[PDB]
Amino acid sequence: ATLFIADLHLCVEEPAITAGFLRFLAEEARKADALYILGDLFEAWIGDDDPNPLHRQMAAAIKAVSDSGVPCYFIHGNRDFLLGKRFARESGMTLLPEEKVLELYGRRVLIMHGDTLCTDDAGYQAFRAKVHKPWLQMLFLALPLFVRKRIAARMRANSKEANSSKSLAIMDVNQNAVVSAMEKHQVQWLIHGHTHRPAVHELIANQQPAFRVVLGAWHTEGSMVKVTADDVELIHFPF
Ligand SMILES: CCCCCCCCCCC[C@@H](O)CC(=O)N[C@H]1[C@@H](OP(=O)(O)O)O[C@H](CO)[C@@H](O)[C@@H]1OC(=O)C[C@H](O)CCCCCCCCCCC
Ligand SMILES: [Mn+2]
Ligand SMILES: [Mn+2]
């Protein structure tokens, strides 16, 4: 089986999630064919040079999975788009582009974080385009770590404030964008996160039955999608 997770938002002061993730790696990822992490692995990323001890332990635990023969892949989220090649090497992860099609046991599946489908949120998409500019990223990364942490803290705070004022519609995926992505790639299956609204949605793409499977955020329990020859299963599991 091939596993998909997203939206862990790992951080020091959410220790149940950290413990749950370590257990997941040892008990589930170890026996899988591959693991895909579809963004927001960390609560925030302000550069691979961050000395946070959590990053060291998480990198080693992920690298132990891929060193055991189970490849680990990462699509960036909105929290952790700065995660780079240095941390990918430390963690034994392969970095993927923002959209990727997999063929799994004969089944073509599109994967992404999900935030690029939220096309009605013009304010977010504006922000996203700016912070994805390599020149601006490279400029941010030149600041002292403590300044980067203050910026991130402010961004987190203003994000929470902005979100409480936004309609549910602009913060969920746009259906035209969903269908457009699934027809661009001619898939009947899409797995994403970002919205923190776990569900299996039925829809039409390519004039055929299609499915959009949304991972849950990790808080008091975890969420994965398990893909086998015969099934695509959204599974919630306790810590
Ligand atoms: C150049 C390199 C910069 C590097 C920075 C590295 C640190 C990144 C830290 C993570 C920030 C991230 O949380 C912001 C974000 O993505 N918010 C969108 C997201 O909501 P979340 O709160 O993240 O769940 O998902 C929501 C649903 O899709 C969406 O609505 C939120 O988007 C917003 O709230 C964006 C607002 O519309 C505008 C953003 C205002 C940010 C304030 C900037 C303060 C910076 C000051 C520095 C001078
Ligand atoms: Mn998230
Ligand atoms: Mn997200």
Author numbering: 2 to 240
Mind quoting what the paper says about this structure?
The LpxH enzyme cleaves the pyrophosphate bond of UDP-2, 3-bis(3-hydroxytetradecanoyl)-glucosamine (UDP-DAGn) to yield lipid X (PubChem CID 123907) and UMP in the fourth step of lipid A biosynthesis. Roughly 70% of Gram-negative bacteria, including the WHO critical priority Gram-negative pathogens for R&D of new antibiotics, utilize this enzyme. The importance of LPS, and lipid A in particular, for the viability and virulence of Gram-negative bacteria makes the inhibition of lipid A biosynthesis a promising target for the development of antibiotics. To enable a structure-based drug design approach for the optimization of JEDI-1444, we produced LpxH proteins from E. coli (EcLpxH) and K. pneumoniae (KpLpxH) and solved the X-ray crystal structures of various enzyme-product and inhibitor complexes during the optimization of the chemical series.
As for HiLpxH, the EcLpxH and KpLpxH proteins copurified with a bound molecule of lipid X in the substrate binding site but we were able to develop protocols to displace the product and form enzyme–inhibitor complexes. The 1.35-Å resolution EcLpxH complex, in particular, provides a detailed view of this portion of the substrate-binding site. In contrast to the highly mutated EcLpxH structure previously published, the lid of our structure is generally well-ordered. One of the lipid X aliphatic tails extends toward the protein surface and is partially solvent-exposed, while the other is completely buried in the enzyme interior. The nonpolar side chains that interact with this buried aliphatic chain are conserved in EcLpxH and KpLpxH, producing a roughly 120° bend in the aliphatic chain. Indeed, the binding of the lipid X product to EcLpxH and PaLpxH structures shows differences at the ring 1-binding site that would be expected to affect inhibitor binding.
